[PDB]
């Protein structure tokens, strides 16, 4: 239903919040990496916005993001959680029980986000491109990309987003 938005908003605030706490991020802190074009391939009703919450410590960031994501997921009801494993496999190719999720995610993140491909990126303006997202006819889905300020930080944010968008495929029949 429309709680999917309730959730993405909870996440967006919890993320924006922990970065500020666990990493001294702020709306007015220099940004190494800036977001360029942020769009979706198959956009069936998702309005996108980018927010800056930059800080210098990429690892403090990555930890805050995983943290928020874990807190948020832990807030879902047993009934809701059950749909997550499917999203996972759909957006990443990874089996997972309703428990091993949190862990499996962390592993995926840690690996991916530390890849040379990622950490070695010295390209200042980076484009975020998800590929599918849906929104109800009445109300569209609002997605916000929180720019951590680092290639490694945004890598986590992006992975999170890829999952989120795969959950919007469930609201729209």
């Amino acid at each position: 239903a429309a709680s999917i938005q309730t959730t993405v908003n909870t996440l967006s605030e919890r993320i924006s919040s922990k970065l500020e706490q666990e990493a001294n991020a702020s709306a007015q802190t220099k940004c190494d990496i800036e977001i360029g074009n942020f769009y979706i391939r198959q956009n069936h009703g998702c309005n996108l916005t980018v927010k800056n919450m930059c800080s210098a410590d990429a690892d403090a960031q990555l930890d805050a993001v995983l943290s928020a994501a874990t807190e948020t997921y832990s807030g879902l009801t047993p009934e809701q959680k059950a749909y997550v494993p499917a999203m996972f496999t759909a957006a990443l190719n990874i089996q997972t029980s309703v428990n091993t999720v949190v862990r499996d995610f962390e592993n995926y993140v840690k690996q991916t986000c530390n890849s040379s491909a990622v950490v070695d990126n010295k390209l200042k303006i980076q484009n975020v491109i998800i590929d599918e997202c849906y929104g109800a006819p009445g109300s569209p889905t609002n997605l916000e990309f929180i720019n951590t300020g680092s290639s490694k930080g945004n890598c986590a944010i992006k992975a999170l987003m890829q999952l989120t968008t795969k959950a919007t495929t469930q609201i729209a029949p």
């Epitope: 702020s26 007015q28 220099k30 190494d32 210098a56 410590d57 990429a58 950490v119 290639s151 490694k152």
Partner: antibody
Framework: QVQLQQSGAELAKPGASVKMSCKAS????????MHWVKQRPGQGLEWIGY????????EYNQKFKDKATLTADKSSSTVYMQLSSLTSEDSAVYYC????????????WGQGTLVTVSA | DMVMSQSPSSLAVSAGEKVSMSCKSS????????????LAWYQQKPGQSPKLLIY???TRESGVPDRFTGSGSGTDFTLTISSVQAEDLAVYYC????????FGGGTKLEIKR
Amino acid sequence: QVQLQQSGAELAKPGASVKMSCKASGYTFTRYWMHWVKQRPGQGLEWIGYINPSTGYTEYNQKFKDKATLTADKSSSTVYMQLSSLTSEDSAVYYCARTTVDGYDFAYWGQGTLVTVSA
Amino acid sequence: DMVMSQSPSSLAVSAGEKVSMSCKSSQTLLNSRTRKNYLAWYQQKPGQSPKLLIYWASTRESGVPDRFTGSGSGTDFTLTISSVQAEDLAVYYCKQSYNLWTFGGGTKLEIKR
């Protein structure tokens, strides 16, 4: 207290290279950006480039792009700046500075490292 | 690209008197949205390292006496020392942090005696 210890003075032959250091302590190394600045005897300050200790991300002044190279060792909490193909024009004192929280201004400075390029 | 012009190059003043120097950029350092001016002032006393005095166009850095005042906006800024003292002898540099970083040529402050 916050403190930045830069290496000692240096004398190099023209065409040679040199590599200075800045040892940081008294704050989380990975929480602030580190900038470098040049100053020829009797002249003003000049921005060279900066580096993010945590990610190794760097950006230089177009003017120094091929002369200076910034690196950082998180395990030792020290930042290195290396100058190549030296010339009399490179003779000056170099400073490392830790930024403020927002990363825009230089809150703390090293004592500087004087480099002399002469045969 | 970006060019910082300070003026005058140097000025003499006696202790007690007041002074003002100018810093002008070839580009605006103001962020319309936030109202922030990405410009700071640095003091460098003979034989020493540069010290941060004012950041954000007018905010005093911790421990800096209030006789130092940062003003201006957009592309015209002024540093003002209410009542200079011998110890204030130094060269003052203004630096922009909007589009990368740039220092002015500085204004050498001399003391009349």
